[PDB]
Design an enzyme around this catalytic site. Structure first.
Site, PDB file in Angstrom:
ATOM      1  CG  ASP A 129       8.505  -0.759  32.602  1.00  0.00           C
ATOM      2  OD1 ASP A 129       7.987   0.045  31.798  1.00  0.00           O
ATOM      3  OD2 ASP A 129       7.870  -1.258  33.565  1.00  0.00           O
ATOM      4  CG  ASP A 131      13.762   2.702  30.986  1.00  0.00           C
ATOM      5  OD1 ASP A 131      13.385   3.144  29.884  1.00  0.00           O
ATOM      6  OD2 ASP A 131      13.084   2.702  32.013  1.00  0.00           O
ATOM      7  CD  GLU A 166      10.590   2.113  27.832  1.00  0.00           C
ATOM      8  OE1 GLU A 166      11.127   3.246  27.761  1.00  0.00           O
ATOM      9  OE2 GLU A 166       9.364   1.986  28.023  1.00  0.00           O
ATOM     10  CG  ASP A 170      12.627   7.419  30.689  1.00  0.00           C
ATOM     11  OD1 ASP A 170      12.920   8.230  29.788  1.00  0.00           O
ATOM     12  OD2 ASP A 170      11.646   6.656  30.591  1.00  0.00           O
ATOM     13  NE  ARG A 218       9.035  10.718  25.175  1.00  0.00           N
ATOM     14  CZ  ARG A 218       8.329   9.729  25.729  1.00  0.00           C
ATOM     15  NH1 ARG A 218       8.870   8.932  26.651  1.00  0.00           N
ATOM     16  NH2 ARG A 218       7.080   9.509  25.333  1.00  0.00           N
TER      17      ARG A 218
END
Length: 352
Positions: A129, A131, A166, A170, A218
Site C-alpha cells: 500500500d 500510495d 502503487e 486513490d 485509471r
C-alpha cells in the site's frame, strides 16, 4: 474563499486561527500533526485542537534518484507515508519550492485537507500500500499543483504482477467531494481509483487542469457517482483512460487527448456500464482519432468504448463555478501551470 474549481469547497488550514509550522522532514510532519491535537491543558481534542498550515521544506532527492536507478528494488521495501487520520480542524500541507518527498500522504477519515506543491516520486512499498496520495472516507479534500511520478513499468515477479509501484491518487470510501487539479502525473501505471470495489460507489470528483504523461490506466477508474474532467492534457496513455463503471456518470469537456489507447471506456465488469457526456475536446468525431493517434482495443468481457465519440448519457447541473479554456489552450499552455514550482498558477483564458 473555498473555491477549488471543483466539487471540493475547502480552504484547508488557511482559515482563522490557523497555526503555521515548518516541517523539515517526514518526521516533523508527523510530530506537528500530533501536537495539533492537544488543547491548552495538554488534553487531546477530537478532530484536532487548531487548524494547521504545514510548509514542508525537506528534500529527498537522494532517495528518489537512487530508486529511479533501481526501480524493481522498490516494491519490496517498507512503505513510507504520513497518515492524516481523523483531523477535521482544517489542514494544508504545502511544499516549499525545491522540496521533495519519497513518502506518501495518506488521508483517512478527515476533511478539509489541501495538499499543494509536493513533488512525490518512486515510492517504496508498492506491494504494501505505498500510495503517493490516498483519500479515504475524506470529504472536502483538494489535491492541487503536485508532481506525482514513478516509472510506467511492471517488474517481473512482483505480487499480482501489479505492485511495482502503487497509485498516484486513490480515492475511496465516503470521500464525497474531492478536487484533483493542476497535477503533473507522469510515469505511473495505476493513476487512481474512485471507489475501491464494485460496492464502493458514489462521490463527486473533479479532475481539472492535470497533465498526464506516460500513464497506463485509471484516470480515474470510476465506480458510480459523478466525475467532471475538464481542461486535462492526456498524452501517452498506454492502457486506458477514464474507465466509467458501475453506472457512473462523467462529463468530459475541453480536454486534449493524444497518443492514447481506450481514452474513454467502460470495461472489466462486463456490465452496469457508466455514461459520458463529451464536449469541447480536441476530438469531436472519429475522424480525429487518426489525427491524434487514438487507438481502441476490445476486452474479453462485454465493454463499451467511446469509438463513436458520442454522448451516451446525461450529467447533472455542475454545482460550482468554473471557466474552462479551449482544448487547444490546454495543449499549448497547461504544462506551464501544472506541477510544482509554478507558484500555484492557474490557466485563465486571458493567458490563452
Amino acid at each position: 474563499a473555498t473555491d477549488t474549481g471543483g466539487y471540493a469547497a475547502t480552504a484547508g488550514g488557511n482559515v482563522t486561527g490557523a497555526v503555521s509550522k515548518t516541517a523539515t522532514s517526514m518526521q516533523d510532519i508527523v510530530n506537528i500533526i500530533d501536537a495539533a491535537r492537544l488543547d491548552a491543558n495538554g488534553k487531546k481534542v477530537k478532530g484536532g485542537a487548531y487548524p494547521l498550515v504545514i510548509t514542508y521544506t525537506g528534500n529527498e532527492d537522494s532517495l528518489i534518484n537512487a530508486a529511479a536507478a533501481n526501480i524493481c528494488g522498490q516494491w519490496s521495501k517498507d512503505p513510507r507515508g504520513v497518515e492524516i487520520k481523523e483531523f477535521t480542524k482544517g489542514i494544508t500541507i504545502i511544499g516549499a519550492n525545491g522540496s521533495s518527498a519519497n513518502f506518501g500522504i495518506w488521508i483517512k477519515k478527515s476533511s478539509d485537507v489541501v495538499v499543494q506543491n509536493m513533488r512525490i516520486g518512486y515510492l517504496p512499498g508498492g506491494a504494501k500500500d505505498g500510495d503517493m496520495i490516498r483519500v479515504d472516507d475524506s470529504p472536502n479534500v483538494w489535491v492541487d499543483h503536485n508532481e506525482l511520478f514513478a516509472a510506467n513499468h511492471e517488474c517481473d515477479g512482483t505480487p499480482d504482477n501489479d505492485t511495482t509501484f502503487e497509485s498516484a491518487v486513490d480515492i475511496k470510501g465516503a470521500s464525497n467531494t474531492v478536487t484533483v487539479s493542476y497535477n503533473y502525473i507522469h510515469g505511473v501505471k495505476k493513476v487512481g481509483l474512485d471507489g475501491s470495489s464494485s460496492s464502493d460507489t458514489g462521490r463527486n470528483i473533479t479532475y481539472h487542469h492535470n497533465y498526464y504523461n506516460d500513464v497506463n490506466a485509471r484516470l480515474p477508474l470510476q465506480r458510480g457517482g459523478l466525475v467532471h474532467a475538464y481542461n486535462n492534457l492526456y498524452t501517452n496513455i498506454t492502457g486506458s483512460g477514464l474507465n466509467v463503471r458501475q453506472n457512473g456518470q462523467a462529463l468530459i469537456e475541453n480536454n486534449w487527448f493524444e497518443k492514447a489507447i481506450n481514452p474513454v471506456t467502460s470495461r472489466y465488469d462486463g456490465k452496469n456500464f457508466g455514461t459520458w457526456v463529451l464536449k469541447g475536446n480536441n476530438i469531436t468525431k472519429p475522424a480525429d482519432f487518426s489525427t491524434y493517434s487514438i487507438t481502441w482495443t476490445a476486452d474479453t468481457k462485454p465493454y463499451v468504448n467511446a469509438d463513436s465519440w458520442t454522448s451516451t448519457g446525461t450529467f447533472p447541473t455542475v454545482a460550482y463555478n468554473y471557466s474552462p479554456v479551449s482544448a487547444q489552450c490546454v495543449k499549448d499552455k497547461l504544462p506551464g501551470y501544472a506541477g510544482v514550482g509554478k507558484n500555484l498558477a492557474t490557466l485563465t483564458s486571458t493567458a490563452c
